[PDB]
Amino acid sequence: ITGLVYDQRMMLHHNMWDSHHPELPQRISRIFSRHEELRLLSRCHRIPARLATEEELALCHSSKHISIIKSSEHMKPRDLNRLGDEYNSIFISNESYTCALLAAGSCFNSAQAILTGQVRNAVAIVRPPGHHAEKDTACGFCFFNTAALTARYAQSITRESLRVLIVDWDVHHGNGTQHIFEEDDSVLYISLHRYEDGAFFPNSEDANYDKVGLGKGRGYNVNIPWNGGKMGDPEYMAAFHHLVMPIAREFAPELVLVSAGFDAARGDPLGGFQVTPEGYAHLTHQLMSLAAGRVLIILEGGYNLTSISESMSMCTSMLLGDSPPSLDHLTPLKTSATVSINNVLRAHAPFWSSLR
Ligand SMILES: O=C(NO)C1=CCCCC1
Ligand SMILES: [Cl-]
Ligand SMILES: [Cl-]
Ligand SMILES: [K+]
Ligand SMILES: [K+]
Ligand SMILES: [Zn+2]
C-alpha cells in the first residue's frame, strides 16, 4: 500500500502583495489533480493531515522562532509584510503558520503509517516547503523544517537512534536540514544541488562537498554540488550510482525521507536544470531498494506547475510498484559533473568504504 496526504487548507498560505509569486497555492492542487487525472489517487490510501503541535516543532526549532511565526496568525498586513521582509525570501499571510503546521503534521502521520506498517511508502503533497528553515529562523519560502521534524518525530515513535536517510533532490541546498543534523550520526543528509561555487541560492559555501559533518556527525553530511552545467538525468543517475546509493546502502537506513523539490526539473523557471519526470521516477525506484521500501516523498520546491505535477506523479507511480519509464539515451556527463562527483568521492571515501 502507498499512502498519500493532501489537504487543500495548505493552499491558504499566500502572498498578499504578489499573487504571482512562484510559491503558489496551486502548486499542491495541481499535483493532486495530476494524480487524479492519471488514476493514481484511487490506487493510494489517503492519510489525513493534522497540525503539528508546538511540542513537535520544538524537536528542531527554538522557542523564539516558534513564538514569532505563531504570532503572525493574528498580525495585520503591516506586521506581516514587515516581519516577512526580516527574513531571506519569505512572505507571510495570517494562514501561513497553520499551513506550515499542517505540512509538518501531514508528514508525521505519513511517517507513522509507514513505521507501523499501515502503508509501505507514501507521498506528501504539502506546502509551504521546509528545507531552508533553520532551528531559529525562516528562510527561502520555508517556516519549519518539515523533513527534519519528520525524522525526529519518527525517532520519537520508534527509538531515538532510528537511522533516517534524508535525500534532498530539490535544486537548492537544504541549509536548514544540513545544520539541524550536522552533528548527528543518526540522520544521514545527502543533498544534490546547483552550487555554482557558492553563487546559487542559498549563497553559502556550507553547500560545498567538503562539508562532511561535524563532531559525531562527521561523514553523515553529503553535499553533491553542481557547477557550470545544465545538469539533467545523466548527471543525477551518475550521482546516484557512484554516491547516493552506495553510501545509503552502507548506512542501512530504517526510514528514507525525500526532500523532493521538483525545481531541478526541465521547465522550472528558477532551477535552470533538465531532470525529466522519468528521471525522478528512476531516482525514486532506486531509493525504494532501501529501508525495506520505507520511503516518504515530501514536496519541497518546484515552480513549473506542469513539470512538478508530472514529476511528482511519476514518483508516486514508482511507489505504487509500476515499472520505471524509459530514460532517454544518457549523454556523456558534463565535464564539471564528473569533477563534482570525484570531489565528493574523495571527501567521503574516508567514512564510507563502499566508495573505495
Ligand atoms: O526553491 C527554493 N528553495 O528550495 C527557493 C528558495 C528561495 C529562492 C527561490 C527558490
Ligand atoms: Cl534561485
Ligand atoms: Cl561520542
Ligand atoms: K538539494
Ligand atoms: K547528519
Ligand atoms: Zn528549491
Q: Could you state, in order of their start, the residue ranges of all structural domains in the chain?
A: 1-356
d(CA 328, CA 310): 16
Query: Do residues 72 and 30 make contact, with C-beta atoms less than 8 angstroms apart?
Result: no
Helix (H, G, I), strand (E, B) or coil at 156: helix
Query: Do residues 191 and 168 make contact, with C-beta atoms less than 8 angstroms apart?
Result: yes
The residue among 349, 164, 146, 184 whose CA lies nearest residue 261 is: 146
Residue with cell 544540513: 178
Helix (H, G, I), strand (E, B) or coil at 258: strand
For residue 170 and ligand 1, the question of a CB distance below 6 A is answered with: yes
Residue with cell 526510514: 255
Q: 215: how many CB neighbours lie within 10 A of its CB?
A: 10
Q: Which of 88, 89, 137, 275 to mutate to test the pocket of ligand 1 (most atoms within 8 A of CB)?
A: 89
DSSP state of 141: T
For residue 301 and ligand 1, the question of a CB distance below 6 A is answered with: yes
Which ligand has its closest atom nearest to the C-alpha of 258? 4
> Ligand 2 mean position to 325 CA, how many Å?
29
Identify whether 61 is a catalytic site residue.
no
The residue among 161, 162, 163, 164 whose CA lies nearest residue 147 is: 164
Would you identify the CATH topology of the domain 1-356? Arginase; Chain A (3.40.800)
Which of the following is catalytic: 35, 132, 173, 282? 132
